[PDB]
């Protein structure tokens, strides 16, 4: 029940 | 052994049996999942905590000047040095006094002074001593000043103390004290910008000769050292390095020379002037200049650590600022003559001279590590040189000379715009940073950097989009907060880290801006 | 004011 | 404008410039005031971190002992460090660790330990850090402390003939049953001048046991006593033999080797991956790593390892932990009383705290009152805490035991964790099929770690994709951790003598250049810096230097004679001939060919009164007058008596220092017969008188009389 | 003459003290080794800083007295006091003196003709300089992948030997008066004894020094070091000036000591000896030991037996392992298969027997291994990392420099891997490779197909094609391996990826020995 993060693209 | 056993078993033989005969079943999966249910917390997401609440900073009075000497506002007295006269370096001030130094006297009423009459009397004792010999003969005067105005406290044995517990007198208690936190300094930025620019004197740091060269490497190495040395010798940061080495070395000799004695040690730095106008001239000027006068107290060494006490007097051309100078006691010393020669008229008249005084503590360890400041150069060199190799090794060419001039390093901000300078002049920024690391080093600073590496590694984690995470960032920022108290360099690098987080978040946002 | 050394014993 | 150095971290990668965040150019921090605060706070953190209310009164000490293992008081804060070890799952980790590598892992490693220790002379016990001498109840270098221990045994029960680690241990355990022990203790006698006359003191088994289990604080790191040390060395060698064989272990192997261990395991993990599986790394760091581990669990584990090895060395393995399972911790300097007047101060001993009681501030009282249970007169008794630095080997054995198990537990999709560990520090690689599962894997491995008492620091640790992580100030990327910040303070002069100082500094610059990977111009500036600080330290300057001084005044007349003035040694005023290419070559060699014949002949003569080149320049440094003024000298009166003895035997036997003397003979007997042989040698052929040789024989036999009378 | 007398009287005084008398009487002489360890344990906390504090004083130094009075004037030139009669600080027969007097005797001292005596004592160092004289130079820059860990002899010297035997040499050359009579080394290795004892025994100067320097003279320091691919032990002495991560230098390999080729000559010697044992299979255990102990090697300056070279040699070749196995020398941590060398970093498992078919419709037993096992491969100009599970390669990565050597690595490691395709190729294997002709001895099968691959060029292509071939996906472009050993990555082998760089070599300190 612990969420995830998918990093859309990068930041620079 | 029989009562040392962990288990419900008491006799060691039963624990021995359970050990030798042990065969584990796969029940640690349910033990580990129940341990998992008991440990509810620590899932971690960067984007969730990506704010990091910026960085917390203390509030209060502005941080003072913690350096044992004054940098930006310090004033110099130039003397062309004789090899046999200046070889002593103690007699340097004795030959200085035959000049105009002996006439300067402060008035009784100081600006911003804590203990005026004491310092004035001591100054007169220095001037009177320099005439005869550089040892001050006052046995009563130093006893109060030493220990940092530390008083020798009489000790009453515990055996006779019990009655004084039964009958309480002398108001018996026990307490300890903590340092008062300060706030982010302003002046520090101006100090950096002053240490960055080249002083008129050529170099302050003794550097030995270059070894013989073979074509392949030693040409590259010798050339790189000649260029880097040539750049960094002219800077004012090199000036403070040189004065630190020479004077702290002088004190280091004075602690073996005259233990338990009061001596007048000059604050000085050696420099040769260099002129690029023409090749043919009489001579480049070789000399040494004087920042001020210094006083040493008892050097006796305890079984536990002793710390010597030191009284610093520095000349300055500059009006004191109560905010950063709070530890300093300033006087109105006199007037000093300053002139120039240019294409214009440039007369120069005269400018008032102020005398800054203070008292500080020097540990023998600090005497050593501050006595060798040359180390900073190396830590700059490596950091610089690598950048030139990693670049050139990509192109398999000699880019060192091209990389030094062409590659742009972000240095500062002006008018809200990010500014960058080439690697040769931004090299001064690294040299100043390492020299401040040497001067300003406190336990607070080491906690700051050693917990700061985590911030930097998370930042570069977001740099290449690797989705980095640290588990309890509130706890990390509480440890970073915990190590920020009074240290000027610590708080400065903290605020500059805030600005780094802001500009980086603007470049791309894995962070927050308030 | 870009003026550092000053005083000369002469 | 505003100068921000950190702005250069924007474009560039951090791992290359990371050496500029560490301020190693400056001095370190250090201790002031009383260390009693940290000690009491740490003991309370030990009893606190061990979560158990079970307390059983010890039979021998009449003091409550809290034995917490395989039992749990659970606190609502699990994430906070735990000190409680479940021994069943522990020995489970031992079993899976063995069955992972060989079936004979522990038997073989213990065999190597038994070998190396049974060989060992107890004299090598003097090698190590400072340890606690209980005779004078002070901290000493291990050699002098051991001399006082053995000497006290000699004056009590007679001289010690053991000459082995085993017999030394047997005597140690025999002394615990001794009802009376005699010491060499210097007592001041007022004759009113106080002369600290040496004396012989007595002690009772009750006090001697506490003095034997006593550990001392160093402003903090602990320095255990002399009776505890040999068994600790035994366990440490066992765990070192265990550490060496482990690929995941970073303790026994370090420096340039740790690097390649990480590289190999990195490419191995990258190859091991599937197309579905996902790899991610974390840099772990552990806080209170020593306070959580417990000697009781180490006793159980040592009993598990020695099960099959021998019953003769097993009883010798179990003795080391039990001395830390009942162990005494010295409190410290104590507290001071003052008024608001800052005039009168009253010093208190650590013994008399319980006299003043509430007179201390409320914080001191809150920390102090619970510790009155386990308090003794001078000292505080705690079972469960592990003092820092002693067992580090076995500690990393534990850590690698936690990391070793992947095949174990469930074959859930993407269950992988493995990495490196050195003492508290550990680098963890975790592989799971999907990203959501990664959080679960990591949490499980932290669950077993905290299950046996390994507590990851939730504040300090951090993790990311495989490219970024740090191990013991080694930061990783595609590149490898270029930093000189570790080795900085060693670049300065070594301080023995001139030639050894400079040549040793050169070889240091070399080794650093190869391993730490500094660039050549950096090493050249390092050469010039070491040369300048060398010249200043030894007060020498080149001949062409204008600098005038004491040693230079001779050089003023020296210059005109010598033809080649560059080939002169630096300490005689010569300019630097060495460079990066010549770093392996000592300065004497490189300058030797170009020296003037008069120079080279006069300077190198071995008869002089005054990798390393001896030359003429090596000398010995005088010790300061400090230790000689106190009664430490009144104790040294024994060490000097060893002195003239060893110097005498070295005058008789020339190879004594080089080849350790052997054979079954007394020192005196060999000295006598050897003196007779040299006397016969010089009399028979060489030039000496016959009546003089009979005089030597007379001195020898007259010496045999006084030797026999003793 | 009184030099012995005063020692005797000193012994009289010492044994007159009972406390020293009993400790002198009780026990062996080995107690000296402990007694010396009981002194001067105190060391100053500060390495340089303390020494600066020491040289600050004008008369800190402890120096001898008699020699100075004998040779030279104690008084100074400039009237700064030099000598006194007072012994202060520690009380020893030396009287304190100023530092500058050393410089004075180095200047005006009366000494002659010490030149030749010096160098051959330090010939280790002096030679390490002599070698730097002859080399040439070129400079460039690159991003260089060095080979991170090699344990390789540095500072190599001819006639290198173990620590114990070199201690024996030390004792014999230093002094005869107290020495044990040591058979094994002195009998066999005599003639180096004659040289060293001859040059160092006649001129009694710096006895201890010369000893401890000769200890290092014959001791190559084998450490774990980065190398850029020139593995000759002569280049290892100075790597720093030569190579590094960004470094490069050239014109080196030429100048070397005579040891480097002599070792290879010893490898060929062990080759021929092992062939002599191979000729007669009646017994291989009793004959080869005779061929070993009988053969006598001539090193350039010294005659030495083959036994003491083999047992004690540093470099372990596939042959040298065989020659050591006959003797009691323990050298482990080495795997030898054909030309290739291997090291085992992981796992374990048992040898099992599986009979699998050839193409000639005949069954032969094959002994294979079932383990999950990660080993490091080592071949000429190529390194790699392999892991096999259940008689088939699981994971593979190649760090090799040259394409052909990469293909050889792949092949040989496939031979040690022994997949099923290993059985499918049998083009005329039985006629020859099946039965080796030595007294009718059947040669093991792994080495059988190994030899079949060493036979011709197409046999390599056969098993190279025996692995699965697939067009590699994007992102594997740099890692993919062509059939001919290239990176173009159009078509590539399965379960293999090239790495751009080298691959680190493991090391373990271990000794294992068993009969053959």
Residue numbers in the entry:
A (entry chain G): 4 to 15
B (entry chain A): 195 to 708
C (entry chain H): 1 to 10
D (entry chain B): 1 to 191, 203 to 230, 242 to 632, 654 to 753
E (entry chain E): 1 to 516
Question: Could you share sentences copied from the article?
Answer:
We solved the co-crystal structure of FluPolC with a peptide comprising four repeats of the pS5-CTD heptad at 4.1 Å resolution. From the difference electron density map, we are able to observe two distinct CTD-binding sites. The better defined binding site we observe in FluPolC (site 1) runs from the P3 C-terminal domain (equivalent to the PA C-terminal domain in FluPolA/B), close to the tips of helices α24 and α26, toward the P3 linker, between P3 C-terminal domain and PB1 helix α16 in the PB1 palm subdomain. We were able to model 12 amino acid residues of the CTD with good geometry and consistent with the observed density. Overall, the CTD residues adopt an extended conformation across the binding surface, giving interaction areas of approximately 1,150 Å2 with P3 and 500 Å2 with PB1. In our model, the phosphate group of pS5a lies in a pocket formed by PB1 residues H461 and R465 and P3 residue P237, whereas the other visible phosphoserine, pS5b, points out to the solvent. Both tyrosines, Y1b and Y1c, and threonine T4b face FluPolC, with Y1b lying close to P3 residues Y241, S661, F663, and PB1 W457; Y1c near to P3 K657; and T4b close to P3 residues N659 and K704. The second binding site we observe (site 2) is located within a groove formed by P3 β6 and the loop between P3 β11 and β12. Because the electron density here was not of sufficient clarity for confident model building and refinement, we instead indicated the site by tracing a 10-residue poly-alanine chain. The structure of FluPolC in complex with the Pol II CTD has been obtained in a transcriptionally inactive conformation.
